Design an enzyme around this catalytic site. Structure first.
Site, PDB file in Angstrom:
ATOM      1  N   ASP A   1       0.687  -1.170   0.169  1.00  0.00           N
ATOM      2  CA  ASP A   1       0.068  -0.024   0.206  1.00  0.00           C
ATOM      3  C   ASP A   1       1.005   1.410  -0.054  1.00  0.00           C
ATOM      4  O   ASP A   1       1.198   1.596   1.208  1.00  0.00           O
ATOM      5  CB  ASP A   1      -0.686   0.032   1.425  1.00  0.00           C
ATOM      6  CG  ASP A   1      -1.789   1.419   1.328  1.00  0.00           C
ATOM      7  OD1 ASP A   1      -1.986   1.793   0.192  1.00  0.00           O
ATOM      8  OD2 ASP A   1      -2.515   1.576   2.294  1.00  0.00           O
TER       9      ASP A   1
ATOM     10  N   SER B   1      -0.909  15.554 -11.989  1.00  0.00           N
ATOM     11  CA  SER B   1      -1.044  15.341 -13.282  1.00  0.00           C
ATOM     12  C   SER B   1      -1.131  16.577 -14.197  1.00  0.00           C
ATOM     13  O   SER B   1      -1.953  17.401 -13.686  1.00  0.00           O
ATOM     14  CB  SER B   1      -2.288  14.367 -13.464  1.00  0.00           C
ATOM     15  OG  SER B   1      -2.758  14.120 -14.701  1.00  0.00           O
TER      16      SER B   1
END
Length: 330
Positions: free
Chosen positions: A35, A199
């Site tokens: 994770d 992004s």
């Protein structure tokens, strides 16, 4: 040193991925959920409340000749999905894919929430976010990667998650045969303890690319792609009959639909998520309403590039002094 381990989807939907981890001496192999959005290595154990164990493999520290109780140390964690777990702490030898760390903090669960009990395939978590998020008290502990970093050939790990198939976690090296083209690296902020990046935009299907900054985290422990409501609405508007269902908890779509791809930007590069990766199947057995793999982050407080996004790429978690992320197509 290096390590390399195969990671395997737990079910036919790729809801999560499990990777075998050797703990203790002799080794006890547990299948952990790696994770990159958390920083605790915790396991089902011989200390876990018996009614909260239902098919998981447990770590028994009393059977490990290298286990040592970390005196006074406790841990307690709550995840973004509302699940939680807590317990005490041992140090022990932990190996992943041939890479060994001695003295790793292994957080033994005394209590786990129902969602963990109900998932017999996941024996614990191995956190790969920054150690500032580790919950051990009163002395915070380091992640497996933090402990291994100095010994690795290069201070990196890579995630290569498969679509409906196994993939690979590598430590200490870049497998240049595992991706196409080049790896585009992008800046990371560690201020929240995550692999947080920005992004450069998105496209829906064959549509035009929208240049817009989307800050979010690369999180292998989250199944879906959680993005701003504007972006998510633009995606699902291209699927006839798709709608946001408050009762189901997100966007659903007719199982008969063909889903468009979704592209996200990494600098000037583009990662394309095929439409099929966005199908999470019937909302309940036999239903013709299917659950979408792109969902709004509006109620989270952060955008999350979970497995839906990451499995479309070869992803480099570069833990150099100034960390960065790399993405390549594959």
């Amino acid at each position: 040193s290096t390590g390399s381990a195969t990671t395997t989807p737990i079910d036919s939907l790729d809801d999560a991925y499990i990777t075998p981890v050797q703990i203790g001496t002799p080794a006890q192999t547990l299948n952990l959920d790696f994770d990159t959005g958390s920083s605790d290595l915790w396991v089902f154990s011989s200390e876990t409340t018996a009614s909260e164990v239902d098919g998981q493999t447990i770590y028994t520290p009393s059977k490990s000749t290298t286990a040592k109780l970390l005196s006074g140390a406790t841990w307690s964690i709550s995840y973004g999905d509302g699940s939680s777990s807590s317990g005490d702490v041992y140090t022990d030898t932990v190996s992943v894919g041939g890479l060994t760390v001695t003295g790793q903090a292994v957080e033994s669960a005394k209590k786990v929430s129902s969602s963990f009990t109900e998932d017999s395939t996941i024996d614990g978590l191995l956190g790969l976010a920054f150690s500032t998020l580790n919950t051990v008290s009163p002395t915070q502990q380091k992640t497996f990667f933090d402990n291994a970093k100095a010994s690795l050939d290069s201070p990196v790990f890579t995630a290569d998650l498969g679509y409906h198939a196994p993939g690979t976690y590598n430590f200490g090296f870049i497998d240049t045969t595992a991706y196409t083209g080049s790896i585009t690296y992008t800046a990371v902020s560690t201020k929240q303890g995550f692999w947080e990046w920005t992004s450069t935009g998105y496209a829906v299907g064959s549509g035009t690319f929208k240049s817009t900054s989307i800050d979010g985290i690369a999180d292998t422990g989250t199944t879906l792609l959680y993005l701003p409501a504007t972006v998510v609405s633009a995606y699902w508007a291209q699927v006839s009959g798709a709608k946001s269902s408050s009762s189901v908890g997100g966007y659903v779509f007719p199982c008969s639909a063909t889903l468009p791809s979704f592209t996200f930007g990494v600098g000037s590069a583009r990662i394309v998520i095929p439409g099929d990766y966005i199908d999470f199947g019937p909302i309940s057995t036999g239903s013709s309403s299917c659950f979408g793999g792109i969902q709004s982050s509006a109620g989270i407080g952060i955008n999350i590039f979970g497995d839906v996004a990451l499995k479309a790429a070869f992803v480099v978690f570069n833990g150099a002094t100034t960390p960065t992320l790399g993405f390549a197509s594959k």
